[PDB]
Nucleic acid binder design. Structure first.
Ligand SMILES: Nc1ncnc2c1ncn2[C@@H]1O[C@H](COP(=O)(O)OP(=O)(O)OP(=O)(O)O)[C@@H](O)[C@H]1O
Ligand SMILES: [Mg+2]
Ligand SMILES: [Mg+2]
Ligand SMILES: [Mg+2]
Ligand SMILES: [Mg+2]
Ligand SMILES: [Mg+2]
Ligand SMILES: [Mg+2]
Ligand SMILES: [Mg+2]
Ligand SMILES: [Mg+2]
Ligand SMILES: [Mg+2]
Ligand code: NA
Ligand code: NA
Lengths: 79, 152, 66, 177, 114
RNA sequence: CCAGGGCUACACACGUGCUACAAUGGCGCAUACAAAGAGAAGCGACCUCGCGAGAGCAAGCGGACCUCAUAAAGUGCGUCGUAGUCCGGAUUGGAGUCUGCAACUCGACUCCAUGAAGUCGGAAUCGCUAGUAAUCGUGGAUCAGAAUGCCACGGUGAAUAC
RNA sequence: UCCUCCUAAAGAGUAACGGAGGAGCACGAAGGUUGGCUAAUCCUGGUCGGACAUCAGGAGGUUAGUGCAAUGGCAUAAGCC
């Protein structure tokens, strides 16, 4: 919920998705920027989100284009 | 010893009844003069007085079958009334089998397995549930109305 | 039939909001006014337009004022 | 009725031309419509059998026969003779007019209308249909309803092959897919 | 009266009898009456059919019981099969907006059980 | 030294609190009566825009003058007539605003919709002797933002002590 | 004490502390007559509906039914209205 400034994405991840769409699909990208929103352009990649100790790979899809990256990586376990 | 127990499906709060200025009389005029009362929840009201006076016809007005001269009777919102009339012949003039007569009042959520349980607790065993409802004893009929109140 | 155990059956004037005037016999005893019929049913367009909610990319791009 | 005349004027010629018959009697025709309401829980609530009978007599202007159980099955705790459901058989002009006032107004009113399946055939030329609710018919004023019961329609025709029975129902503007 | 599902309550001021629709609250109810020219104080019983007719169509602008009860059902179902964090909370019946589950949260947990 | 996570985890138990369960009350309109305190990368009038949280320009003030800042219970009229209710506000979906590099885990507030438990609480147990108890609002420290806690101020204002 | 089957050797009968089961009733209809009707079991299509309920077709053929144990019967039905 970041008002009228537009959607926020870390710079080091903006180039990572940009330089990856050029060459197609590759190995999952490793990122710690959980706070970065999912732009429509990074659909189809498997960016790996760091939930504290391990990187979980999320397959970006059409419906997941408004939620932040960390929304899809549970950071604590239970049972 | 029959096992009778009345329960209550939806308990209601605050006042259960209110009667405001219920003067009424047939041909003596003041059968009961300027009645005014408010009946709470959990009351066990015993209406006494004995003979020819409106000892009944109060209950008949409260249920509504005897229109009052003046006044208004406001039952509670969800008030469901089980009536056991003093003279109850009209509900047995029709000649149904005891089983069908008790099954008339089965509610939403019970079987004729649960219908016959009331008769069993009321001591109608296997043949006395085949008699016509017309031919029954006075006590065996009062019990059969108790089992309709319990069922409702 | 079997001597007046069935319900009454008389002709009624069933008419749609768009017309579709039909003279049928039915177990109502009173005329009815209802929606469209199969004559003008949107079967070629209702299921085409049934899907309306979906697609978050245009919702994201509509907010893109920056 | 109107649909009977429609059939005997147009569909006979259409289907004779299509299937290369030689006699008017060879082209199939609707024989009867069977409507049933299997309440199942009649034993749970017998007066719901009377409610269902009223609903089905409203849907079609014929009193329902109350069918009885045939075999004592221990899967649902019912025995021989126990009433289970209601049924009505429609033939002739009442059949034709019920068919008409189904097709024209009852079918379009179903919620989430997709289209009646063409594979709902018995391999001899008969059709079966579930409606999921009776409010879809105009015979209920939202007053008799305490359940959301539905009908089973079975169109029984004198057709011999399923492809033969398909075209007959198609020619009556049936809401197929 | 009779509006989308049922506007059964009579003897209620129309501004409030309309609340009984799944989707019509207080300020959305007041917009309906104001955009149709009916006074708030007027009871539904006093409300003649001459203005109920323009009341049935007024509610059609906004979503109502039949559509809304599914419109939100898709929204909850959208999260659960998406696998989002808010979807995970919905599956287990735990608070979704990030609040105390240590001792409170009996509304979403349910009755207290051992 | 750094990035991300945790202290916010949830079958459960306990302590201290806030809001209620309504009619000596809820809501709408109108109109009275305070004390104390804070402010310079700070408080920020008036005007315009927005249903609203707020936004744009922007005077005054390191101050008995300027701002935060409209006290609320109350009073007058109207409606609701004992219902899970025009009580209650949890929970949830959608749409936002503002701080802040950044609001997913994990902020506050606003708008539309849904509207739960709750109809005076078992054994038991706590506070209070007068401007006290009860209730009603106001401010400050901490602080970029973030209190129902803590500290502080006033309004109405009791019962009883053999 | 009575009933049914096997031992019982293709008429009847035939024993054992031989092998197996039943009876000490029921029904004013479950008796009489007249008129009609035909089952079990799966195979295909449908609201709750499910392996099994009711519906509609087809195969099947009496593999069902008989107030009560077994044997012999029963469609012209002795079975069901
Ligand atoms: N149906 C009626 N028609 C005419 N007059 C009636 C009727 N019912 C009652 N009354 C009159 O009203 C009077 C009131 O009778 P009510 O039923 O109150 O008596 P009661 O005290 O209940 O009698 P009891 O104990 O003898 O049954 C009667 O005595 C009679 O005069
Ligand atoms: Mg802590
Ligand atoms: Mg100062
Ligand atoms: Mg409750
Ligand atoms: Mg021999
Ligand atoms: Mg011999
Ligand atoms: Mg011899
Ligand atoms: Mg016999
Ligand atoms: Mg015979
Ligand atoms: Mg015989
Ligand atoms: Na009496
Ligand atoms: Na007697």
């Amino acid at each position: 919920r970041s008002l009228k400034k537009g959607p926020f994405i870390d710079l080091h991840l903006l180039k990572k998705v940009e330089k990856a769409v050029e060459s197609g699909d590759k190995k999952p990208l490793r990122t710690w920027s959980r706070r970065s929103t999912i732009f429509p352009n990074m659909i189809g990649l498997t960016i790996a989100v760091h939930n504290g100790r391990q990187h979980v790979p999320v397959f970006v899809t059409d419906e997941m284009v408004g939620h932040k990256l960390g929304e899809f990586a549970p950071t604590r376990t239970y049972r | 010893n029959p096992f009778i127990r009345f329960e209550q499906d939806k308990k209601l709060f605050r006042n259960a009844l209110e009667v405001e200025g219920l003067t009424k009389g047939f041909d003596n005029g003041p059968l009961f003069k300027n009645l005014n009362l408010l009946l709470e929840v959990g009351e066990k009201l015993a209406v006494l007085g004995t003979n020819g006076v409106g000892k009944s016809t109060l209950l008949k007005t409260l249920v509504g079958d005897l229109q009052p001269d003046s006044g208004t009777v406001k039952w509670s919102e969800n008030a469901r009334i089980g009536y056991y009339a003093q003279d109850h012949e009209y509900e047995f003039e029709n000649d149904l089998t005891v089983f069908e007569w008790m099954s008339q009042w089965k509610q939403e959520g019970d079987d004729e397995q649960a219908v016959r349980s009331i008769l069993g607790r009321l001591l109608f065993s296997q043949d006395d549930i085949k008699k016509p409802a017309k031919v029954l004893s006075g006590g065996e009929k009062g019990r059969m109305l108790f089992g309709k109140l319990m069922m409702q | 039939m079997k001597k007046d155990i069935h319900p009454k059956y008389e002709e009624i004037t069933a008419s749609c909001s768009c017309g579709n005037v039909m003279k049928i016999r039915s177990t109502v005893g009173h005329d009815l006014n209802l929606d469209v019929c199969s004559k003008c049913h949107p079967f070629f367009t209702g299921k085409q337009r049934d899907v309306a909610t979906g697609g978050r990319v245009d919702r994201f791009n509509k907010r893109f004022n920056i | 009725a109107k649909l009977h005349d429609y059939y005997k004027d147009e569909v006979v010629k259409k289907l004779m031309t299509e299937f290369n018959y030689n006699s008017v009697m060879q082209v199939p025709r609707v024989e009867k419509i069977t409507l049933n309401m299997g309440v199942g829980e009649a034993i749970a609530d017998k007066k719901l059998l009377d409610n269902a009978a009223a609903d089905l007599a409203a849907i079609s202007g014929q009193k329902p026969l109350i069918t009885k159980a045939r075999k004592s099955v221990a899967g649902f705790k019912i025995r021989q003779g126990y009433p289970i459901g209601c049924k009505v058989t429609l033939r002739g002009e009442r059949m034709w007019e019920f068919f008409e006032r189904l097709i024209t107004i009852a079918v379009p009113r179903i919620r989430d209308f997709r289209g009646l399946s063409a594979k709902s055939f018995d391999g001899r030329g008969n059709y079966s249909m579930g409606v999921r609710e009776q409010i879809i018919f105009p015979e209920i004023d939202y007053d008799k309803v305490d359940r959301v019961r539905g009908l089973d329609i079975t169109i029984t025709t004198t057709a011999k092959s399923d492809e033969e029975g398909r075209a007959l129902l198609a020619a009556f503007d049936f809401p197929f897919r | 009266a009779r509006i989308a599902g049922i506007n059964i309550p009579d003897h209620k001021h129309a501004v409030i009898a309309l609340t009984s629709i799944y989707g019509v609250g207080k300020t959305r109810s007041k917009a309906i009456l104001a955009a149709a020219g009916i006074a708030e104080d007027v009871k539904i019983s006093e409300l003649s059919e001459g203005q109920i007719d323009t009341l049935r169509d007024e509610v059609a602008k906004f979503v109502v019981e039949g559509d809304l009860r599914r419109e939100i059902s898709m929204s909850i179902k959208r999260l659960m099969d998406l696998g989002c964090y808010r979807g995970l909370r919905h599956r287990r019946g735990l608070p979704v907006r990030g609040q105390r589950t240590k001792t409170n949260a009996r509304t979403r947990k349910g009755p207290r059980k051992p």
